[PDB]
Amino acid sequence: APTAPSIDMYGSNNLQFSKIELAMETTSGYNDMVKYHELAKIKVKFNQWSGTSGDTYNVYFDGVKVATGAITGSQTTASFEYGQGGLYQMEIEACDATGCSKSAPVEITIADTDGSHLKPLTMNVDPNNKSYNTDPSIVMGTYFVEWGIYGRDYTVDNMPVDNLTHILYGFIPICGPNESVKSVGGNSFNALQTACRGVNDYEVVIHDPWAAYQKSFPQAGHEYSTPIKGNYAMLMALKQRNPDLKIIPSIGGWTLSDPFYDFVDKKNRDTFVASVKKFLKTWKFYDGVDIDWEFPGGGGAAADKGDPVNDGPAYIALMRELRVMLDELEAETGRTYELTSAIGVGYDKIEDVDYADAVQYMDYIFAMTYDFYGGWNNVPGHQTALYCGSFMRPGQCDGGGVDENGEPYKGPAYTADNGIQLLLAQGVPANKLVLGTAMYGRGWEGVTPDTLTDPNDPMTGTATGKLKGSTAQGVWEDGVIDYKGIKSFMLGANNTGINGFEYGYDAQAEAPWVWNRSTGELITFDDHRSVLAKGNYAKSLGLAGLFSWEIDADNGDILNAMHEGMAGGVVTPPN
Ligand SMILES: C[n+]1cc2c3c(ccc2c2ccc4cc5c(cc4c21)OCO5)OCO3
């Protein structure tokens, strides 16, 4: 028989092959950093220094023949293409008319972006996240933010994955106009300009390739030379652990929506939709797309953008066109892909889209039932309430009244139910609506007892400015505090108030607050009671479930309350 091939491990890239080529120690344009191949190029060198070499080689993966070729004397390179990622035991055999002889088996890795080469992720979840057996029909969603791996020190293996159905990854930018990104300061705008170098306008890109696929996470077993690292390799390993989990890229958001206003021109929609198809072919762990345009008709970060006439029909066309494209991917792959969108729920945001037309293309609408009131001005109110609070004036709730100046309200007040009922009354099906819960508070200072028109209710006061604090307190921006910061610095373990704060609850609105009457610090948030009220409301109206912004800010209490409030319930999944 021929001499058995001896595999040259270092001549064959120690048997590590990848379908994706990712640049590693540089930051450049997206199309220069990311190159995906439908088939991996496998090149394995072997030698046969003694004896006869034979005529032909065969390569086996786990005892199955996957390639064959000619022997070339004493040193041969087996070259072939392979599609399916995984870890395989490889043997190389040499054959001639006298017989065949085979190398010892050795493990070969073919990396792919579905995580097929990876073991299930090792988790490190805060144990205050509890176990539930919520029915698998109900949505339990959250947003994981790409930058939460920095100061917030919250990584993919911290997520309480068994308590989630959907993880929306915030956020994928669109190349083009992006002045709003400069409002976050720091290097966000410049990092986008780098990502977009050599990329056509209106195509998606990864904003932070260090966080997405370059950073080595030791908890995930990453080495500097591992071919895919970052949050994305951890999400691929998480999908191996929990295969029914849906992980969906969220495109846009508050700071990244400026390009959507040019989608009134179909040519820019076509560029965008094609780039999303390419993105989902490149990054296989993703299960759909979420469109967070804030907002059709304007009222978002860009004060000079928004067209009430034209943006709704553009949004609807976008959804139509994305569902055509996702149907093409479903034909090509055999997979199911979801199309979702997070939307404003103030009456003035809902009126700018005919959701009765859009929702036929969509699996879910994530209703942004939060940010109703906040530190952008000095008017207290409930930022995430279901219903109208005690603080509101007569006729403010339904918008028939007049304000303190005598001027008509322009529409119903900002509450979750006023927006959910506007959506239901136009025919959006309840079982496509997902209710938002806040894992943060918004707040003010200067709300001292002398400013209250009703002494029992601090939401009748007036502020002097935004809540101030430090990042150790969960205050990453003035006026906004992580829930886990409110619990550590204002509520305490028994939920009865520490550090000079008192807890209160507006039972009409279903909304909690903490108030320090000495500093005038007042914070509006969601807590166990108000999240149980949202779950009861969702069960009552047959909504699809609940989601939250943002998972790094919880300590487990808010996601536990989301499950607790949904106990016993089931829903019909959208078809
Ligand atoms: C995109 N980034 C990169 C960062 C970063 C840091 C620290 C903070 C950030 C950051 C903080 C807040 C952000 C907020 C954002 C954002 C991006 C960021 C953001 O885009 C959407 O709104 O050290 C390395 O790189």
Ligand SMILES: C[n+]1cc2c3c(ccc2c2ccc4cc5c(cc4c21)OCO5)OCO3
């Ligand atoms: C000014 N801002 C910044 C935001 C923001 C976010 C998320 C939401 C907001 C936001 C939401 C509602 C708002 C409503 C407003 C406003 C500002 C905002 C507002 O000014 C007038 O009424 O992550 C980046 O930064």
